[PDB]
């Protein structure tokens, strides 16, 4: 079995940033910190934390750290139950901009109605999102990844549909001899050539790109002719209804979405999951 | 936090039905059971279990029992998660290009024969190699450094010998009055003036340098006359045997080599070390 005192020490090293920080935080000698790490590492057979500052968990160490933060969540829920007061637990979530700007906001209502829980939303790309989940820096995440990261369970939420849209004037500007010049048409991007697959055959030259790093500004730039773009049908629907933009393409792009959460008998985590799933049921496709 | 040992004792009392049942189940005295319960109760401020039989949890005690069963499930799942992640995680080594291109590859055979083990090799100069070891970013390292870095143990692997070689034509091209113009002779380098020490006396002029950042391409450039260079005798032996290059110099340069690994009771690391030592025995000089 794994010594829970030693797990606490590893977590303290990480939370405090160094071995000395864990020493001061835990009121134990530096030798005790070192001895506890040595023992835990010898139990696992791997180095668990970097000897630099700020202290970082290794790949093997991330497992234990994630586990330690799970135990912290159980302890808080337990203390809250005995206490006779609403839990007041901070929930940290990784989410993508497209989910946050379309179907997710109804979750805010649900969380608000609880005791005094708080949300910390992190907007992350796919790779960092999974890393946050792995090391325990978030307890849940909305993601395109279907395979569960270690320590987590996965739930399918439904499918997000993107439409290829542009203003009629912009499309007409890049019509050439009755054929649309996809490569030459300025395009919108959320940040710094897959999007032309099956739209252009030969090699694609350089492309004109505008970058607008917010879901709503991204939609506004498309809406206003700065470029075409792939926009979630939820965002695009009103512009299409208003005739502000048109479909460049009858072929939608569908992206399955998943909710990944710590595997833990957590009543907060169960509750948050229900809220997210219910929102995705109401706002995503089968 | 609540002492998890005490939570186990409370859980055992309920699961076993009496204080004496928890005693035998836990291999502790009835006094030890009582001490833990009383301690847990005063930490909480509530009576947790009846001292009658069968033991019944109070309202607060039902909470801690529920929590204890949650923590038991987490502990078992964590142990299973770590075990599976360790299998997936590659052992990380820092090595220099000269070892990787000569005596090291036989290590691959040994690792391949294990379960489904993986290696991550990092090609590093001497300085970054030792820092990677120090900080825990690699578990082992091939190094010229003989003194053990903190957290690691050292083993001598043997000696690497370098030869100064060139094509016959290149040497003859820079023979003048029977004396070789070392400074004027183009040289090969692995990347961006020690190498002429004991070959030229006074201050050295400019030098003609080609850079080829691969061990094998480095050898090819020498083999093909682009410049002379210091080449591991392992690599140079075939070219010398074929008469493609010659020795510019009977003075070899010998560099003792060492294997440094983190001190950990790991059978994985022990196996890797043995494989490395054995490969070094076959491809380095005593």
Numbering used by the authors:
A (entry chain A), B (entry chain B): 0 to 191, 197 to 290
What did the original publication write about this model?
As no structure of LysG of C. glutamicum was available, we set out to solve the structure of full-length LysG with and without basic amino acids as ligands by single-crystal X-ray crystallography to obtain a sound experimental basis for analysis of effector binding. Interestingly, all attempts to crystallize LysG in the presence of l-lysine and l-histidine failed, but diffraction datasets could be collected to solve the structure of LysG in the free form [LysG], and together with bound ligand l-arginine [LysG + Arg] at 2.52 Å and 3.00 Å, respectively. As is the case for all known LTTR structures, one monomer adopts an extended conformation, whereas the second monomer arranges in a more compact conformation. Binding of l-arginine in the extended protomer of [LysG + Arg] leads to a small but substantial tilt of helix 6 by 8° compared to the conformation in the ligand-free protomer [LysG], which enables coordination of the ligand l-arginine by amino acid residues D124 and E125 in the [LysG + Arg] structure. During size-exclusion chromatography, LysG eluted as a peak representing a molecular mass of 158 kDa. Based on the mass of 34 kDa deduced from the protein sequence, this indicates a tetrameric assembly of LysG in solution.
LysG detects the basic amino acids l-lysine, l-histidine, and l-arginine and activates gene expression of the amino acid transporter encoding gene lysE in the presence of elevated intracellular amino acid concentrations. LysG is a member of the LysR-type transcriptional regulator (LTTR) family, a large and highly conserved group of TRs ubiquitous in bacteria. LysG shows the typical features of LTTRs, a two-lobed regulatory domain linked to the DNA-binding domain by a flexible loop. Two LysG monomers are coupled by dimerization of their DNA-binding domains, forming a winged helix-turn-helix motif responsible for DNA binding.
